[PDB]
Swiss-Prot record, chains A, B:
Single GO term (MF): tRNA binding
Positions spanned in the full protein: 1011 to 1493 of 1649
Organism: Homo sapiens (Human)
Protein name from the UniProt record: eIF-2-alpha kinase GCN2
Signal peptide span: none
Lineage: Eukaryota, Metazoa, Chordata, Craniata, Vertebrata
Disease field: Pulmonary venoocclusive disease 2, autosomal recessive: A disease characterized by widespread fibrous obstruction and intimal thickening of septal veins and preseptal venules, a low diffusing capacity for carbon monoxide, occult alveolar hemorrhage, and nodular ground-glass opacities, septal lines and lymph node enlargement showed by high-resolution computed tomography of the chest. It is frequently associated with pulmonary capillary dilatation and proliferation, and is a rare and devastating cause of pulmonary hypertension.
């Protein structure tokens, strides 16, 4: 089997490979497998409040981005597999009918980097909301799906310090928009890649083994591994304990930039390379902190020495938004955003005839689901109304009048739904209004001539009134304005 | 090879199958193949006008839908392959790492039908904008991508006749809101599936071979096969010319409902099967035409006898918007939308323990790219501005003033973009403003104290005015409200 498979694979354009691919492509699928493929997604229960809340949050976030002059852009869904970048990060893997291997997008940074490299994009601002996929541990199931939002700035200027402040200011605006996010006391963390490399070199880590150290540090940070396992893993590379001790005394310190100056000052007495790296790192950190202070951002700005986050992809400043949420009597951190400068990805994807400088690029990613859950968990629940007014007809002879009234309402810019059944009882109408979250209803009947009865179900008070038909639109507009 | 392949495939959970799946998923991809995978999408050029126009069109369409009380919903991307529904239509096919066969969504109707069936949704309205994929004829390439919009109504009422009128009225509103679509003189076409089946049965086609006739008729309608080829293909189906001769005279008739009455009533003189179908096929058509007349839709309503469109998926009324645009002195019918009732798709996806009545369901689909192309082609081109005001600093010492001015302007709700460089010449600034379609700029300098020189590039007249800093926001708001 192995020999035959290898021989078939040796010529992907051969007749044997083409015939073999078809045979592993025309197999029948049992109905039980088809039904059970996504038994965890389509459970059966449904709720409209969650969809309305998600729509509102997405609309608010979209509105904030458009204020800065941004535009919406999209990238191709499928990209060829590259094991260099996603060696450890497990992504969904798929193969097509032509024998290729493709991957569902793990993140939107790499596709946009490829887009910029292949499209000769120099200056641009961009926002996008799409889905991301993560394969499931169990077999015969659907990939997990999450919602992600992106905001990228691409500039062709030597000055690359203020866009980093603009991104953080945009995230601060989004935080200020929602009262749910304002009570969590978010904090801002910062770090530099050059400073991290200088610290590693000073601690004695060989320059040829840096990537493995980055990977193990990231894995220990994101997995909460035990101290014993971390010590054993480091000793697996035959690394001395003194290097571990000297590295763990540096990543435990976080605080104000002026407070951590004595710690950073000790690194300026090292060799030429260490001093040269720390100079640039300190310069950029100081400048960014100063410009953030000039913008009057109330959120605390802290410099984190041990902040490792996709360090293989960023060349410069990296930041995160960390808030301590008291969940189950435990201060569990939750990340709302992250990003940094990633101009190093452009040289990989350029074509044979690409001439010109490499422009700067700064991006950020937000977790919409966290915002939605935080807003929905608030005790002072936010109520979203699908339609302002609901038109109900009583009797079969009043259907045309209700249809004409509803059509007139739409022409005036008022959102209104029209019920379809004319034999609905009053109790059924009240139950429907309560379930569908509707507070204003207009009853059209032929027993009152050219008058309609507007009913309101507000809190524990039930108010009804008679409104002239010619002034129903004006009455609704006045009520909406006064609301 | 075939015997070994069959033996391996006979046990999908066997060790040999897993080993083959691992081996076929660990191939090496050459850089030349990787670079050329999507060489047809990333053509190397870019334009911001197209993205802005598409964003505007999508925002307008989304705004129209929300006026009716609609909500946004999404469905899982990957669904198991089903050759029963997509036997003829070509769809992109992929296989995951476990050998299971999955398909990229060809359309959004079937995933939403599955969603409704598994979630037992009774009443709901929904809109969604996503992408659809079509595989390419050439080998080693990326699938094609198109943009589609959806609008579905699910009702549990027995007297469900008016939702079709509501859908057609919504599309009429969308047509009205764009001056580009108003000048194309669109038309509305209607038909019924019961009437088509009754016509086929009256023509003498056997009742056990109807699906093949539906498919060949759809193929002839879409691909526009030659008359000789259609006649030859019909003979190959073991069908005599007796059914074909009397079938080409019943699908050439188009006109008003009252004008085509002489043709339709001649089919009510038959057995108890033809008349029973024609009664239902005429009642709903008459009722829908009456309701459309009551709503004052200016678009002419015509009933099409030969309108075949996914007849396998609709049980009831189907409609389609057709406009005879002029392209190279040839009338090419461009379809804007189509849809119909599809309540028959629900029982397929229901579970064996699912119990309850099957509710009605009416949906539609719109081609956004056609709207964007139509609008962008207009001679009186619509100008979209990314930002109202552009803040430009002169000299290195005025950067802080420009930054705080832009922050204050953002605080007041005005969308403004701040330039990053300071040594930019006047000619470069003018070129940048012209390229990005920006009309208002604010030059900040310390040579004029607290005064900001506001420049305008309105047409051929250039206006320079001195504006106090404290009244810049008021000036911008006044200018925006003036026009």
């Amino acid at each position: 089997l192995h020999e035959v498979l290898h021989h078939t694979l040796t010529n992907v354009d051969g007749k044997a490979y083409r015939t073999m691919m078809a045979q592993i492509f025309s197999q029948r699928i049992s109905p039980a497998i088809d039904y059970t493929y996504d038994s965890d997604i389509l459970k059966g229960n449904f709720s409209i409040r969650t969809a309305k809340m998600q729509q509102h949050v997405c609309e608010t976030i979209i509105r904030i981005f458009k204020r800065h002059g941004a535009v919406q852009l999209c990238t191709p869904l499928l990209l060829p597999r590259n094991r260099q970048i996603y060696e450890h990060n497990e992504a969904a893997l798929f193969m097509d009918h032509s024998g290729m291997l493709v991957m569902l997008p793990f993140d939107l940074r790499i596709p946009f980097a490829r887009y910029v490299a292949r499209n000769n994009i120099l200056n641009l601002k961009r926002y996008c909301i799409e889905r991301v996929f993560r394969p499931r541990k169990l077999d015969r199931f659907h990939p997990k799906e999450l919602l992600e939002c992106a905001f990228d700035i691409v500039t062709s200027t030597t000055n690359s310090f203020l866009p980093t402040a603009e991104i953080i200011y945009t995230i601060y605006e989004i935080i200020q928009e929602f009262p749910a996010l304002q009570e969590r006391n978010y904090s801002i963390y910062l770090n530099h890649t050059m400073l991290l490399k200088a610290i590693l070199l000073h601690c004695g880590i060989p320059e040829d083994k840096l990537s493995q150290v980055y990977i193990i540090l990231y894995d220990a940070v994101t997995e909460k591994l035990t101290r014993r396992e971390v010590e054993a893993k480091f000793c697996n590379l035959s690394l001395s304990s003194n290097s571990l001790c000297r590295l763990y005394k540096f990543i435990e310190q976080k605080g104000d930039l002026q407070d951590l100056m004595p710690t950073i000052n000790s690194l300026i007495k090292q060799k030429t390379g260490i001093a040269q790296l720390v100079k640039y790192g300190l310069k950029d950190l100081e400048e960014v902190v100063g410009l953030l202070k000039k913008l009057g951002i109330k959120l605390q700005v802290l410099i984190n020495l041990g902040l490792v986050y996709k360090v293989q992809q960023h060349n410069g400043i990296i930041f995160q938004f960390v808030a301590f949420i008291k969940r189950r009597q435990r201060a569990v951190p939750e990340i709302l955003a992250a990003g940094g400068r990633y101009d190093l990805l452009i040289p990989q994807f350029r074509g044979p005839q690409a001439l010109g400088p490499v422009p700067t690029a700064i991006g950020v990613s937000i977790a919409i689901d966290k915002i939605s859950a935080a807003v929905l968990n608030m005790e002072e629940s936010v109520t979203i109304s699908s339609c302002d007014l609901l038109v109900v007809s009583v009797g079969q002879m009043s259907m045309s009048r209700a249809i004409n009234l509803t059509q007139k309402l739409w022409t005036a810019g008022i959102t209104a739904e029209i019920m379809y059944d004319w034999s609905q009882s009053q109790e059924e109408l009240q139950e429907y209004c309560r379930h569908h979250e509707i507070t204003y209803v207009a009853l059209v009947s032929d027993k009152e001539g050219s008058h309609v009865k507007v009913k309101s179900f507000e809190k524990e008070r039930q108010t009804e009134k008679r409104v002239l038909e010619t002034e129903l639109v004006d009455h609704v507009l006045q009520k909406l304005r006064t609301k």
